[PDB]
Amino acid sequence: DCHLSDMLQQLHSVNASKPSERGLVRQEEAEDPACIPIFWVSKWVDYSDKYGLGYQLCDNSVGVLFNDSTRLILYNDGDSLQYIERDGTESYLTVSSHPNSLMKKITLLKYFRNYMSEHLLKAGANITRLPYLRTWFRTRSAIILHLSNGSVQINFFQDHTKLILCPLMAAVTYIDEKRDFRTYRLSLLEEYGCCKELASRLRYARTMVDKLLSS
Ligand SMILES: BrCc1cccc(I)c1
């Protein structure tokens, strides 16, 4: 299930502990820099009416989830490709080899790359295996991005805040409006509690991970 069940369990636990009602809140105490995620989606472009969803990961790699549920990933070296059919079957290729099979999808991918590079701002710019985008959807309030390493990222439209959930670390990273990165250990959030806004977004995240599992 790509650790969705695990993540669901970790969020029910933090939310059940009602961490914004704790009298003596020390959210600063729940931080843990040995849980900082390796990957997250730094930019994305929804062209899903026509071709699909383009994105860039923080390592500068660029991927597309095409409508046919195939994925093409261009590594940060500008040439090496990874290709995933619906089957999940992976294969590796290079741009320079010019594979006749994927000419069209390469061109599309380069368009997405071009657009993102010139027109979009990076997420989490001022801080320091290659997964692909498994699934995604968006509500009025947010886009939800589920990576194949189990990570779930939720980007909120209103205020530009972002959640990155890592079930393997049982951790949450929170990017605020001021672009500040903070990484928390979920269990420690139950103990030290947190602010009302991190709290409501974790309630929203549990509902969103529910939604992923009903599909
Ligand atoms: Br219709 C040209 C095109 C294709 C893929 C992505 C983008 I952004 C634009």
PDB file of C-alpha atoms and ligand atoms in Angstrom:
ATOM      1  CA  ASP A   1       0.000   0.000   0.000  1.00  0.00           C
ATOM      2  CA  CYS A   2       3.098   2.226  -0.207  1.00  0.00           C
ATOM      3  CA  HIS A   3       3.066   2.860   3.592  1.00  0.00           C
ATOM      4  CA  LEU A   4      -0.273   4.750   3.451  1.00  0.00           C
ATOM      5  CA  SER A   5      -1.612   2.495   6.197  1.00  0.00           C
ATOM      6  CA  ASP A   6       1.435   3.272   8.348  1.00  0.00           C
ATOM      7  CA  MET A   7       1.016   7.023   7.711  1.00  0.00           C
ATOM      8  CA  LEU A   8      -2.679   6.796   8.516  1.00  0.00           C
ATOM      9  CA  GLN A   9      -1.846   5.144  11.824  1.00  0.00           C
ATOM     10  CA  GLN A  10       0.703   7.786  12.700  1.00  0.00           C
ATOM     11  CA  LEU A  11      -1.773  10.615  12.031  1.00  0.00           C
ATOM     12  CA  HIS A  12      -4.679   9.096  13.931  1.00  0.00           C
ATOM     13  CA  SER A  13      -2.283   8.879  16.852  1.00  0.00           C
ATOM     14  CA  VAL A  14      -1.069  12.498  16.697  1.00  0.00           C
ATOM     15  CA  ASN A  15      -4.569  13.853  16.075  1.00  0.00           C
ATOM     16  CA  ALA A  16      -6.220  11.717  18.805  1.00  0.00           C
ATOM     17  CA  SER A  17      -3.697  13.163  21.265  1.00  0.00           C
ATOM     18  CA  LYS A  18      -5.293  16.594  20.506  1.00  0.00           C
ATOM     19  CA  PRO A  19      -1.924  18.416  20.405  1.00  0.00           C
ATOM     20  CA  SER A  20      -3.203  22.028  20.235  1.00  0.00           C
ATOM     21  CA  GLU A  21      -5.119  21.797  23.563  1.00  0.00           C
ATOM     22  CA  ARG A  22      -2.069  20.930  25.636  1.00  0.00           C
ATOM     23  CA  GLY A  23      -1.561  23.643  28.268  1.00  0.00           C
ATOM     24  CA  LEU A  24       2.232  23.828  28.120  1.00  0.00           C
ATOM     25  CA  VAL A  25       2.999  23.764  24.352  1.00  0.00           C
ATOM     26  CA  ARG A  26       6.664  23.454  23.325  1.00  0.00           C
ATOM     27  CA  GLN A  27       6.416  22.806  19.575  1.00  0.00           C
ATOM     28  CA  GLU A  28      10.037  23.930  19.244  1.00  0.00           C
ATOM     29  CA  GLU A  29      10.963  20.855  21.306  1.00  0.00           C
ATOM     30  CA  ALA A  30       9.510  18.413  18.760  1.00  0.00           C
ATOM     31  CA  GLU A  31      12.078  19.287  16.074  1.00  0.00           C
ATOM     32  CA  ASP A  32      14.531  16.613  14.903  1.00  0.00           C
ATOM     33  CA  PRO A  33      17.044  17.320  12.067  1.00  0.00           C
ATOM     34  CA  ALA A  34      17.798  13.576  11.698  1.00  0.00           C
ATOM     35  CA  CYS A  35      14.384  13.217  10.061  1.00  0.00           C
ATOM     36  CA  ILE A  36      14.799  15.824   7.313  1.00  0.00           C
ATOM     37  CA  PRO A  37      13.360  14.257   4.103  1.00  0.00           C
ATOM     38  CA  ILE A  38      15.606  13.492   1.104  1.00  0.00           C
ATOM     39  CA  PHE A  39      12.945  14.257  -1.519  1.00  0.00           C
ATOM     40  CA  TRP A  40       9.984  16.528  -2.015  1.00  0.00           C
ATOM     41  CA  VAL A  41       8.181  18.147  -4.950  1.00  0.00           C
ATOM     42  CA  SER A  42       9.684  21.590  -5.409  1.00  0.00           C
ATOM     43  CA  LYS A  43       7.497  22.664  -8.352  1.00  0.00           C
ATOM     44  CA  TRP A  44       4.499  21.244 -10.219  1.00  0.00           C
ATOM     45  CA  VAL A  45       2.325  22.095 -13.217  1.00  0.00           C
ATOM     46  CA  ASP A  46      -1.117  20.578 -13.777  1.00  0.00           C
ATOM     47  CA  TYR A  47      -1.740  20.151 -17.508  1.00  0.00           C
ATOM     48  CA  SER A  48      -3.966  17.138 -16.879  1.00  0.00           C
ATOM     49  CA  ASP A  49      -6.674  18.096 -19.349  1.00  0.00           C
ATOM     50  CA  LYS A  50      -4.209  17.558 -22.191  1.00  0.00           C
ATOM     51  CA  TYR A  51      -1.030  15.699 -21.232  1.00  0.00           C
ATOM     52  CA  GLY A  52      -0.581  15.219 -17.497  1.00  0.00           C
ATOM     53  CA  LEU A  53       1.125  16.508 -14.366  1.00  0.00           C
ATOM     54  CA  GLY A  54       4.668  17.849 -14.536  1.00  0.00           C
ATOM     55  CA  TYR A  55       6.859  18.283 -11.510  1.00  0.00           C
ATOM     56  CA  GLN A  56      10.338  18.829 -10.281  1.00  0.00           C
ATOM     57  CA  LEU A  57      11.841  17.180  -7.231  1.00  0.00           C
ATOM     58  CA  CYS A  58      14.153  19.076  -4.861  1.00  0.00           C
ATOM     59  CA  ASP A  59      17.178  17.265  -6.346  1.00  0.00           C
ATOM     60  CA  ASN A  60      16.381  19.059  -9.661  1.00  0.00           C
ATOM     61  CA  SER A  61      15.098  15.907 -11.377  1.00  0.00           C
ATOM     62  CA  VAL A  62      12.017  16.379 -13.500  1.00  0.00           C
ATOM     63  CA  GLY A  63       9.123  14.017 -13.938  1.00  0.00           C
ATOM     64  CA  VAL A  64       5.757  13.757 -15.630  1.00  0.00           C
ATOM     65  CA  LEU A  65       2.733  11.651 -14.749  1.00  0.00           C
ATOM     66  CA  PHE A  66       1.077  11.311 -18.165  1.00  0.00           C
ATOM     67  CA  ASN A  67      -2.661  10.700 -18.440  1.00  0.00           C
ATOM     68  CA  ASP A  68      -2.124   7.060 -19.547  1.00  0.00           C
ATOM     69  CA  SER A  69      -0.694   6.488 -16.044  1.00  0.00           C
ATOM     70  CA  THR A  70       2.868   6.226 -17.390  1.00  0.00           C
ATOM     71  CA  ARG A  71       5.688   8.234 -15.841  1.00  0.00           C
ATOM     72  CA  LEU A  72       8.869   9.633 -17.337  1.00  0.00           C
ATOM     73  CA  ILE A  73      11.665  10.917 -15.159  1.00  0.00           C
ATOM     74  CA  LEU A  74      14.604  12.987 -16.312  1.00  0.00           C
ATOM     75  CA  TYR A  75      17.504  12.855 -13.828  1.00  0.00           C
ATOM     76  CA  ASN A  76      19.437  15.955 -12.746  1.00  0.00           C
ATOM     77  CA  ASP A  77      22.189  15.096 -15.252  1.00  0.00           C
ATOM     78  CA  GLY A  78      19.933  16.261 -18.094  1.00  0.00           C
ATOM     79  CA  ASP A  79      20.297  12.988 -20.049  1.00  0.00           C
ATOM     80  CA  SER A  80      19.508   9.855 -18.057  1.00  0.00           C
ATOM     81  CA  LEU A  81      15.850   8.739 -18.175  1.00  0.00           C
ATOM     82  CA  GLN A  82      13.729   6.371 -16.110  1.00  0.00           C
ATOM     83  CA  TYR A  83      10.457   5.153 -17.572  1.00  0.00           C
ATOM     84  CA  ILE A  84       7.575   3.505 -15.762  1.00  0.00           C
ATOM     85  CA  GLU A  85       4.640   1.854 -17.503  1.00  0.00           C
ATOM     86  CA  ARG A  86       1.366   1.330 -15.624  1.00  0.00           C
ATOM     87  CA  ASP A  87       2.625  -2.181 -14.811  1.00  0.00           C
ATOM     88  CA  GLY A  88       5.231  -0.589 -12.546  1.00  0.00           C
ATOM     89  CA  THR A  89       7.921  -2.130 -14.755  1.00  0.00           C
ATOM     90  CA  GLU A  90      10.871   0.269 -14.822  1.00  0.00           C
ATOM     91  CA  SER A  91      13.377   0.809 -17.612  1.00  0.00           C
ATOM     92  CA  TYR A  92      16.321   3.189 -18.066  1.00  0.00           C
ATOM     93  CA  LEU A  93      17.348   5.107 -21.167  1.00  0.00           C
ATOM     94  CA  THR A  94      19.248   8.207 -22.297  1.00  0.00           C
ATOM     95  CA  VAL A  95      18.085  11.268 -24.225  1.00  0.00           C
ATOM     96  CA  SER A  96      21.193  11.190 -26.427  1.00  0.00           C
ATOM     97  CA  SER A  97      20.299   7.690 -27.675  1.00  0.00           C
ATOM     98  CA  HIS A  98      17.057   9.200 -29.011  1.00  0.00           C
ATOM     99  CA  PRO A  99      14.759   6.218 -28.405  1.00  0.00           C
ATOM    100  CA  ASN A 100      12.100   6.098 -31.116  1.00  0.00           C
ATOM    101  CA  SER A 101       9.677   4.671 -28.566  1.00  0.00           C
ATOM    102  CA  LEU A 102       9.556   7.770 -26.347  1.00  0.00           C
ATOM    103  CA  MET A 103      10.337  10.701 -28.666  1.00  0.00           C
ATOM    104  CA  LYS A 104       6.936  12.215 -28.020  1.00  0.00           C
ATOM    105  CA  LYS A 105       6.994  11.876 -24.249  1.00  0.00           C
ATOM    106  CA  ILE A 106      10.521  13.253 -24.112  1.00  0.00           C
ATOM    107  CA  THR A 107       9.417  16.390 -25.999  1.00  0.00           C
ATOM    108  CA  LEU A 108       6.462  16.902 -23.653  1.00  0.00           C
ATOM    109  CA  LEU A 109       8.750  16.384 -20.649  1.00  0.00           C
ATOM    110  CA  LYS A 110      11.131  19.040 -21.938  1.00  0.00           C
ATOM    111  CA  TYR A 111       8.223  21.484 -22.318  1.00  0.00           C
ATOM    112  CA  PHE A 112       7.249  20.957 -18.688  1.00  0.00           C
ATOM    113  CA  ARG A 113      10.901  21.384 -17.682  1.00  0.00           C
ATOM    114  CA  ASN A 114      11.151  24.626 -19.647  1.00  0.00           C
ATOM    115  CA  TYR A 115       7.969  26.066 -18.164  1.00  0.00           C
ATOM    116  CA  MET A 116       8.839  25.221 -14.569  1.00  0.00           C
ATOM    117  CA  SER A 117      12.387  26.546 -14.902  1.00  0.00           C
ATOM    118  CA  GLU A 118      11.361  29.983 -16.137  1.00  0.00           C
ATOM    119  CA  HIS A 119       7.945  30.618 -14.548  1.00  0.00           C
ATOM    120  CA  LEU A 120       7.740  28.805 -11.229  1.00  0.00           C
ATOM    121  CA  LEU A 121       9.323  29.445  -7.852  1.00  0.00           C
ATOM    122  CA  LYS A 122      11.070  26.551  -6.063  1.00  0.00           C
ATOM    123  CA  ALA A 123       9.571  25.186  -2.857  1.00  0.00           C
ATOM    124  CA  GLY A 124      11.969  25.189   0.061  1.00  0.00           C
ATOM    125  CA  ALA A 125      14.787  26.802  -1.871  1.00  0.00           C
ATOM    126  CA  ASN A 126      16.953  28.020   1.008  1.00  0.00           C
ATOM    127  CA  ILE A 127      17.765  24.694   2.700  1.00  0.00           C
ATOM    128  CA  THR A 128      19.988  21.672   1.916  1.00  0.00           C
ATOM    129  CA  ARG A 129      16.853   5.772  -4.914  1.00  0.00           C
ATOM    130  CA  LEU A 130      14.888   8.244  -7.100  1.00  0.00           C
ATOM    131  CA  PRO A 131      11.130   8.028  -6.510  1.00  0.00           C
ATOM    132  CA  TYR A 132       8.393   9.007  -8.927  1.00  0.00           C
ATOM    133  CA  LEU A 133       4.906  10.475  -8.482  1.00  0.00           C
ATOM    134  CA  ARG A 134       2.602   7.558  -7.711  1.00  0.00           C
ATOM    135  CA  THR A 135      -0.667   9.468  -7.611  1.00  0.00           C
ATOM    136  CA  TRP A 136      -2.049  12.931  -7.015  1.00  0.00           C
ATOM    137  CA  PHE A 137      -5.301  14.823  -6.779  1.00  0.00           C
ATOM    138  CA  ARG A 138      -6.393  18.281  -5.801  1.00  0.00           C
ATOM    139  CA  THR A 139      -9.251  19.634  -3.732  1.00  0.00           C
ATOM    140  CA  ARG A 140     -10.436  23.228  -3.649  1.00  0.00           C
ATOM    141  CA  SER A 141      -7.935  23.755  -0.814  1.00  0.00           C
ATOM    142  CA  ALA A 142      -4.831  21.774  -1.785  1.00  0.00           C
ATOM    143  CA  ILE A 143      -2.978  19.474  -4.153  1.00  0.00           C
ATOM    144  CA  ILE A 144      -1.978  16.113  -2.692  1.00  0.00           C
ATOM    145  CA  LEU A 145       1.152  14.409  -4.090  1.00  0.00           C
ATOM    146  CA  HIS A 146       1.987  10.804  -3.136  1.00  0.00           C
ATOM    147  CA  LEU A 147       5.567   9.749  -3.970  1.00  0.00           C
ATOM    148  CA  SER A 148       6.617   6.152  -4.609  1.00  0.00           C
ATOM    149  CA  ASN A 149       8.865   6.204  -1.562  1.00  0.00           C
ATOM    150  CA  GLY A 150       5.731   6.505   0.599  1.00  0.00           C
ATOM    151  CA  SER A 151       6.047  10.261   1.156  1.00  0.00           C
ATOM    152  CA  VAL A 152       2.817  12.286   0.934  1.00  0.00           C
ATOM    153  CA  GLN A 153       3.095  15.978   0.188  1.00  0.00           C
ATOM    154  CA  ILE A 154       0.158  18.381   0.585  1.00  0.00           C
ATOM    155  CA  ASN A 155       0.378  21.886  -0.873  1.00  0.00           C
ATOM    156  CA  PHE A 156      -2.221  24.358   0.378  1.00  0.00           C
ATOM    157  CA  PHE A 157      -3.407  27.000  -2.089  1.00  0.00           C
ATOM    158  CA  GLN A 158      -4.670  29.779   0.196  1.00  0.00           C
ATOM    159  CA  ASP A 159      -1.486  30.543   2.101  1.00  0.00           C
ATOM    160  CA  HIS A 160       1.222  28.525   0.299  1.00  0.00           C
ATOM    161  CA  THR A 161       1.920  26.286   3.323  1.00  0.00           C
ATOM    162  CA  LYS A 162       3.138  22.759   2.705  1.00  0.00           C
ATOM    163  CA  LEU A 163       3.210  19.441   4.569  1.00  0.00           C
ATOM    164  CA  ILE A 164       5.629  16.646   3.762  1.00  0.00           C
ATOM    165  CA  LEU A 165       4.756  13.390   5.530  1.00  0.00           C
ATOM    166  CA  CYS A 166       7.322  10.598   5.832  1.00  0.00           C
ATOM    167  CA  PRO A 167       5.898   7.383   7.341  1.00  0.00           C
ATOM    168  CA  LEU A 168       9.285   5.637   7.339  1.00  0.00           C
ATOM    169  CA  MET A 169      10.564   8.324   9.730  1.00  0.00           C
ATOM    170  CA  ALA A 170       7.155   8.880  11.359  1.00  0.00           C
ATOM    171  CA  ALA A 171       7.934  12.568  10.771  1.00  0.00           C
ATOM    172  CA  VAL A 172       6.267  15.679   9.310  1.00  0.00           C
ATOM    173  CA  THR A 173       7.991  18.610   7.631  1.00  0.00           C
ATOM    174  CA  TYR A 174       6.132  21.930   7.686  1.00  0.00           C
ATOM    175  CA  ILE A 175       6.874  24.795   5.307  1.00  0.00           C
ATOM    176  CA  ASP A 176       5.243  28.045   6.578  1.00  0.00           C
ATOM    177  CA  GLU A 177       4.298  31.192   4.618  1.00  0.00           C
ATOM    178  CA  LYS A 178       7.770  32.626   5.318  1.00  0.00           C
ATOM    179  CA  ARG A 179       9.258  29.584   3.495  1.00  0.00           C
ATOM    180  CA  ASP A 180      10.795  28.378   6.779  1.00  0.00           C
ATOM    181  CA  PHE A 181      11.525  24.639   6.978  1.00  0.00           C
ATOM    182  CA  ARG A 182      10.685  22.807  10.239  1.00  0.00           C
ATOM    183  CA  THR A 183      10.897  18.995  10.631  1.00  0.00           C
ATOM    184  CA  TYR A 184       9.022  17.320  13.479  1.00  0.00           C
ATOM    185  CA  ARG A 185       8.824  13.794  14.861  1.00  0.00           C
ATOM    186  CA  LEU A 186       5.118  12.916  15.030  1.00  0.00           C
ATOM    187  CA  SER A 187       5.356  11.094  18.367  1.00  0.00           C
ATOM    188  CA  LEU A 188       7.102  14.096  19.936  1.00  0.00           C
ATOM    189  CA  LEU A 189       4.273  16.345  18.674  1.00  0.00           C
ATOM    190  CA  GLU A 190       1.863  14.285  20.766  1.00  0.00           C
ATOM    191  CA  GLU A 191       4.054  14.868  23.805  1.00  0.00           C
ATOM    192  CA  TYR A 192       5.005  18.524  23.445  1.00  0.00           C
ATOM    193  CA  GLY A 193       1.894  19.565  21.489  1.00  0.00           C
ATOM    194  CA  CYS A 194       1.852  22.126  18.687  1.00  0.00           C
ATOM    195  CA  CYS A 195       0.193  25.325  17.485  1.00  0.00           C
ATOM    196  CA  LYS A 196      -3.428  25.333  16.334  1.00  0.00           C
ATOM    197  CA  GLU A 197      -2.437  25.685  12.668  1.00  0.00           C
ATOM    198  CA  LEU A 198      -0.007  22.819  12.389  1.00  0.00           C
ATOM    199  CA  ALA A 199      -2.732  20.906  14.257  1.00  0.00           C
ATOM    200  CA  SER A 200      -5.537  21.660  11.787  1.00  0.00           C
ATOM    201  CA  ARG A 201      -3.369  20.789   8.784  1.00  0.00           C
ATOM    202  CA  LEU A 202      -2.583  17.354  10.317  1.00  0.00           C
ATOM    203  CA  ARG A 203      -6.308  16.815  10.735  1.00  0.00           C
ATOM    204  CA  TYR A 204      -6.679  17.729   7.081  1.00  0.00           C
ATOM    205  CA  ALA A 205      -3.837  15.370   6.163  1.00  0.00           C
ATOM    206  CA  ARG A 206      -5.467  12.356   7.838  1.00  0.00           C
ATOM    207  CA  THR A 207      -8.571  12.972   5.762  1.00  0.00           C
ATOM    208  CA  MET A 208      -6.420  13.239   2.625  1.00  0.00           C
ATOM    209  CA  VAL A 209      -4.495  10.004   3.283  1.00  0.00           C
ATOM    210  CA  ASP A 210      -7.994   8.322   3.834  1.00  0.00           C
ATOM    211  CA  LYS A 211      -8.857   9.565   0.385  1.00  0.00           C
ATOM    212  CA  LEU A 212      -5.723   8.085  -1.204  1.00  0.00           C
ATOM    213  CA  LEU A 213      -6.582   4.649   0.294  1.00  0.00           C
ATOM    214  CA  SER A 214     -10.116   4.672  -1.183  1.00  0.00           C
ATOM    215  CA  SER A 215      -8.487   4.491  -4.610  1.00  0.00           C
TER     216      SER A 215
HETATM  217 BR1  LIG B   1       0.808  22.171 -25.847  1.00  0.00          BR
HETATM  218  C1  LIG B   1       2.635  22.334 -25.207  1.00  0.00           C
HETATM  219  C2  LIG B   1       2.944  21.823 -23.839  1.00  0.00           C
HETATM  220  C3  LIG B   1       3.068  20.457 -23.653  1.00  0.00           C
HETATM  221  C4  LIG B   1       3.354  19.941 -22.400  1.00  0.00           C
HETATM  222  C5  LIG B   1       3.518  20.799 -21.326  1.00  0.00           C
HETATM  223  C6  LIG B   1       3.395  22.167 -21.504  1.00  0.00           C
HETATM  224  I1  LIG B   1       3.654  23.416 -19.827  1.00  0.00           I
HETATM  225  C7  LIG B   1       3.110  22.689 -22.761  1.00  0.00           C
END
